[PDB]
Amino acid sequence: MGPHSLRYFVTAVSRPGLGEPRYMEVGYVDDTEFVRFDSDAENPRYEPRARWMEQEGPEYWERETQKAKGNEQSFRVDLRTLLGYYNQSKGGSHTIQVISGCEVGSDGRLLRGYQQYAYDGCDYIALNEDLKTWTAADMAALITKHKWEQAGEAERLRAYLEGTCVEWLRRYLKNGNATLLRTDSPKAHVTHHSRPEDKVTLRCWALGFYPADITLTWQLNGEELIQDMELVETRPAGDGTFQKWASVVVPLGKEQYYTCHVYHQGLPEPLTLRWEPPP
């Protein structure tokens, strides 16, 4: 169904003296979270959302919980290992993050594979596009590189990527495919705000849309105002949908010379709006 992705976001954060490291695995289908493991519980387990639960069965999630706890403890060792690599004191907090998964094309074939690591928020090591070689970011990661090169880690990942990862993704759709069902078109409107003197601000709002990708533009009699334009980062409404706005400062009395354009994949075609003053 066009290209699709299965991606896992992994976080391991040490907190010496204040407990065991906090470990999390978060799985996303097409940027939609569908499962989460969080080690910060008395008896922690995989928490698949309703669909993946019982459309997969209890045994399965049991086994993934056990695999999660296995990963958790392996990462515990890694945090200790990296202290050594970087000659860091044992008393500070550090983080390891991974993005791991695959993207398939509409033909079901693997388009892209992900296996990338960061330490304290900087790139550490990553599997290259060729799915055979590794890019180490620094001297510490060269130690991990040599070690994986020896054990053939890259080949271990290709098998997962082309086997398990890709197959999970093919399984999800058919069965469902719920990111077009989750498509929501923006509803737009322009607001009007006073500036000092003879300028006014026109603010074009896009609300209640999913997915997050969107474009807002202002045009003055054809020709995007490719500057002087203010906007905010797209932001979640908290109900699943997103918001954005773009504003321009225009002369008082000339508000009808400006048009806002809204481009979103949910729309039959770009929205075009102007400031509408009540009468």
Binding site: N71, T81, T144, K147, W148, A151
Partner: peptide, 8 residues
């Protein structure tokens, strides 16, 4: 389904 991770 996430992979099994290997030691750094």
């Amino acid at each position: 389904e996430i992979i099994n991770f290997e030691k750094l």
